[PDB]
Write a protein that binds this ligand. Structure first.
Ligand SMILES: [Zn+2]
Ligand SMILES: [Zn+2]
Ligand SMILES: [Zn+2]
Lengths: 78, 193, 48, 105
């Protein structure tokens, strides 16, 4: 049960951060300056790591979760 | 064996030994080294540069296009296609939201209506203003109108490009081209932008 | 199967430059490769 | 097209002073009002649009060669559904013989 719950959370975070790797939630691709995108709050050291600083991974994810959900639904339609 | 990476059989050897031109190459590649030895260390910078250079023509963002014999005047009611007469609702919004982009005085009687593919606009991460600015910069002999950037499915994003009379004045001494032929040729240029 | 479950729920999102069909095929080809530890039972059944 | 009211022929479209004139080979000429202002059109991704698979999706629950899935139908409460995967984006649609269709269709 713990394995399934942790795997669900890890997979969901991995999909979210693989989607917003180059794609920017604010439109276009990321504009990385000083390790941080100017348009959004993405940090370079968070795209591939979701364990070292879990507080920051839960902050960026919470900001653009909805936008993410609508985009995910829209892709899966028509 | 897929198109664009065909290395099956003896195909790359034939391209070399026959001295075939670049147009006849089915597996051409290229390796680009980042100008900054510092940037080349980090993969996110390398990944965003790699996605920065990827030919997205205006054609692949389109679901369907219609070439309409219409002119736009803001005040006078001009005739419109019955299927797209509902487009007038977002015409008015565009004019009050773009007081600097008023329609010119030399709009020809030729209109191109576009219906953007929203899935490709999401998968490729292309904003509407990126398309509009790219089209306006490359095509000055046209007038471009569009709807709002909508986040709700079922409501499309419509790109409507009106041709100015200066498009036909470019080369009309070559009389073996009717106005319909220039207008269609304008469609091909705009799509391949 | 876990890739199929993601597909059925619409959890598979391809990167830029790949369609969902191509990304799903890339995942399925990678997930169906034998590990290096496949020789542990092979080598335990034989005397070199 | 425009069809001549006299000989039911396909008229030729010309443009004069900002108006469309359909002229036939029998001399009859008419001018289109609104429905003839469509010079040309094209639609992309024709091989994966919903209009292509309408008959197939309607017939999917009855084809015995289609993949089934162990998932309840929310309408008739049958315990299996027919799953189909259409398009290059691999769109999954669940259908039932009662008329239920995931994606609300
Ligand atoms: Zn960003
Ligand atoms: Zn006639
Ligand atoms: Zn049912």
């Amino acid at each position: 049960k713990k394995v399934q719950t942790a795997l669900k959370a890890s997979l969901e975070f991995n999909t979210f951060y693989a989607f917003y790797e180059s794609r920017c939630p604010k439109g276009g691709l990321h504009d990385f300056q000083d390790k941080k995108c100017v348009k959004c709050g993405l940090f370079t050291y968070i795209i591939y790591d979701h364990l070292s600083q879990p507080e920051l991974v839960h902050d960026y994810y919470n900001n653009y979760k909805d936008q993410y959900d609508k985009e995910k639904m829209s892709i899966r339609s028509i | 064996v897929a198109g664009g990476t065909n290395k099956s059989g003896i195909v790359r050897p034939q391209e070399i030994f026959s001295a075939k031109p670049v147009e006849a190459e089915q597996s051409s590649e290229m390796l680009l080294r980042l100008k900054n030895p510092e940037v080349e260390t980090n993969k996110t910078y390398a990944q965003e540069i790699a996605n920065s250079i990827e030919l997205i023509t205006f054609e692949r963002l389109i679901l369907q296009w219609h070439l309409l014999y219409e002119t736009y005047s803001s005040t006078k009611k001009n005739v419109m296609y019955p299927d797209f007469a509902s487009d007038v609702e977002w015409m008015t919004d565009f004019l009050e939201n773009h007081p600097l982009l008023q329609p010119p005085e030399d709009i020809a009687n030729w209109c191109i209506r576009l219906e953007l593919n929203k899935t490709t606009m999401i998968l490729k991460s292309i904003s509407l203003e990126s398309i509009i600015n790219s089209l306006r910069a490359k095509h000055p002999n046209t007038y471009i109108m569009h709807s709002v950037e909508n986040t709700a499915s079922g409501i499309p994003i419509i790109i409507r490009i009106y041709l100015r009379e200066s498009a036909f004045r470019r080369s009309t001494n070559t009389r073996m081209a009717t106005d319909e032929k220039i207008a269609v040729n304008v469609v091909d240029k705009l799509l391949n932008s | 199967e876990e890739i199929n479950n993601r597909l059925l729920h619409g959890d598979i999102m391809p990167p830029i430059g790949l369609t969902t069909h191509d990304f799903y095929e890339k995942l399925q080809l990678n997930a169906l490769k034998f590990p290096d530890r496949i020789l542990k039972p092979i080598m335990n059944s034989i005397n070199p | 097209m425009k069809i001549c009211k006299a000989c039911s022929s396909c008229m030729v479209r010309t443009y004069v002073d900002g108006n469309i004139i359909f002229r036939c080979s029998c001399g009859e000429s008419v001018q289109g009002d609104s429905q003839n202002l469509l010079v040309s059109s094209k639609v992309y991704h024709t091989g994966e649009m919903e209009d292509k698979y309408k008959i197939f999706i309607k017939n999917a629950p009855f084809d015995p060669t289609n993949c089934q899935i162990k998932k309840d139908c929310p309408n008739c409460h049958l315990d299996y559904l027919t799953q189909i995967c259409i398009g290059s984006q691999k769109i999954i649609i669940l259908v039932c013989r009662c008329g239920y269709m995931s994606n609300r269709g």
